[PDB]
Structure formats: C-alpha cells, structure tokens
Amino acid sequence: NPGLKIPK
Amino acid sequence: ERPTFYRQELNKTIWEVPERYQNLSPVGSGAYGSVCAAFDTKTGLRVAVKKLSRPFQSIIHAKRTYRELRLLKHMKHENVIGLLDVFTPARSLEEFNDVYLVTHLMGADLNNIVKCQKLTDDHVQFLIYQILRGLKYIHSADIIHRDLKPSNLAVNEDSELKILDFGLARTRWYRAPEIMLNWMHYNQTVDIWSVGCIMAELLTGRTLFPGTDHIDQLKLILRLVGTPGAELLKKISSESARNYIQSLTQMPKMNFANVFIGANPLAVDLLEKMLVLDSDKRITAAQALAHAYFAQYHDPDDEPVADPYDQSFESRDLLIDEWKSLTYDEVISFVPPPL
Secondary structure (H helix, E strand, C coil): CCCCCCCC | CCCCEEEEECCCCEEEEECCEEEEEEEEECCCEEEEEEEECCCCEEEEEEEECCCCCCHHHHHHHHHHHHHHHHCCECCECCCCEEECCCCCHHHCCCCEEEEECCCEEHHHHHHHCCCCHHHHHHHHHHHHHHHHHHHHCCCCCCCCCHHHEEECCCCCEEECCCCCCCCCCCCCHHHHCCCCCCCCHHHHHHHHHHHHHHHHCCCCCCCCCHHHHHHHHHHHHCCCCHHHHCCCCCHHHHHHHHHCCCCCCCCHHHHCCCCCHHHHHHHHHHCCCCHHHCCCHHHHHCCHHHCCCCCCCCCCCCCCCCCHHHHCCCCHHHHHHHHHHHHHHCCCCCC
C-alpha cells in the first residue's frame, strides 16, 4: 500500500 | 439491552447518547442535521455521531429519514462507509422523536489529501481502484450514489478509501451532463462520469470541467467529448433540451492524449472510456476494474457484489406516522457489525 500524510 | 444514556447541551443542541460515546466535539451542521466527532469506547474508533434534524417533520422528511437508514443499513463493503450504530433515547414508538447515526470518522477527504502532498501514479491507481471497487458493490444492488466528488471520499494514511454521503434526494463539476440539465433518467454510469472527473483532476492538479453555471459547464464538457449525435439525441426526452442541443455549433471529440500529455497512457485510455457522453456507452464499474491500468491491484475473487436491495418502499404513499413507525422498526432491528 502507498502511504499518505493526513492533515495536519 | 438498552445502554445508559447521558444528556448534554452543546452549541444550543441537546445530545442524548449512550455513555459508550465520549468527548463529543461539534464539527458542523446543516439542513440534514448536526454532527459531533466522538471517541467510541466500544470499538476504540473516532466516530461521527449525526443527530438528524426534524427527521419526521413532514411526509417528505420522514420518508427521507427512512430512505437514509435503509441505505446505510444495507452497505457492508470495505470501500463504502457503513453504519456502526443507530440509536434513539426513546423507549417506545410513542416517545420516538430523535434519531442518531454513527459512522467511522476516517482519515481525511480526498481534497485534503491533495492539499498536503503530490500523489504518484501508483496512488492514483490505488485510489481510483478502490472507488470503482466500492461502486461495483453499490451498482450491483442497483444503488446509484449520484453525488461522487472528492469531498465525499475518505482516505487514511494507508491510502485506504471509502465512499460516503450518498445522494438522498429523489459543486456541480463532477456531475454527468444528462442529470445536470435533467436530459433523462439516471443510470448507474452517472457515477462513472464522476469518477472520470475525479481521476482527471488527480492526474493533472486541475478541475476538469470547472463551469460557473450549467451552460458554461455543458460547453466545457462538449468541447472535450464532442456534441451529441443523433443516436444520443433520440434518448433525450425534453423537446426543448433537444432543440437547444441542436442549436449548438457541432464539435468533434478531442484526442484525450493531447489533453493529458505525460500521464500514463493506460490512465488516459481509461478516462476515454469513462467520459463518454452517451451513458449507455460508458464503461461500467465491473468492466473498469479489469482495465489494464489497475493490473497491480485487480483481484476478481476479491471484488464482491451486494445483496439485493429492495427499494419498493419508494413507491409507497404513507402517513408521516407510518414512515416514522417504519423508521423506528429499522432502529430496533439494527445489528452492529462484528467487533
């Protein structure tokens, strides 16, 4: 799975 | 059996909820109702607790309340928001007035994701894949979302995605042309149009059809996909709509590869299949999942369909108290998902 920043 | 409820006023609104829900913090309201974020001590999840506003104030509202609860209770799929809980502090039908819906408060929406980073082609593949996976499930029950857009998609730090906030009525940038000007009855592929608009934007960093009003938006759409031919005109019921369409200067379809230069050509190919003006000719969610763009994610044994969804209630003509009583029955019959 690709990862993501969740604001904030 | 019945939990213990506690009662508090927050922002001039009374909330009476089971003690399992803690630390409620208002996070917005509207015509629909009013929402608090809370911590659910039973699941350990952050949740949205929505208190419906005036759920039974008219026949119209009562039926809409029933429609929403029926829909939410039916959805059980990894890429669709499900009902964690529904409750009322009422002990009987006769004192039944308030309805509360509880759902997972997951990550951030797609707009906020885009605000804090640049997505890779791999991200776009996985995000769109999950939307289509959710849609295959929804469409297989003859449910149409009607209102897909980035703010109706929840995403977490593992890029897992869920579709939420179904259209419950019976911006405008993501909406298929045939429903925007009411050219004809919706089919499921209005949702596919929306996905195309969302994907284009994820690839390019720009809204695809940011029209200021209905006409301006139609013109931007037709410039890309070409004006309708005779076959499509035949399916438009309104004589006036037909006359208007025929009044436009004809325009050819554009070559999408020119419009999306540098994007994965398989992505562009999928866009061409989603953004077709005639809805009968758009790719379906099931077909899109098999598209080569998603080869690294597609698993035909793990793209489940839904149980049939009985919408016959939509043609019933009932009293306010009858819709209210049917709603109460649904609250009573609710069984939570496995913990």
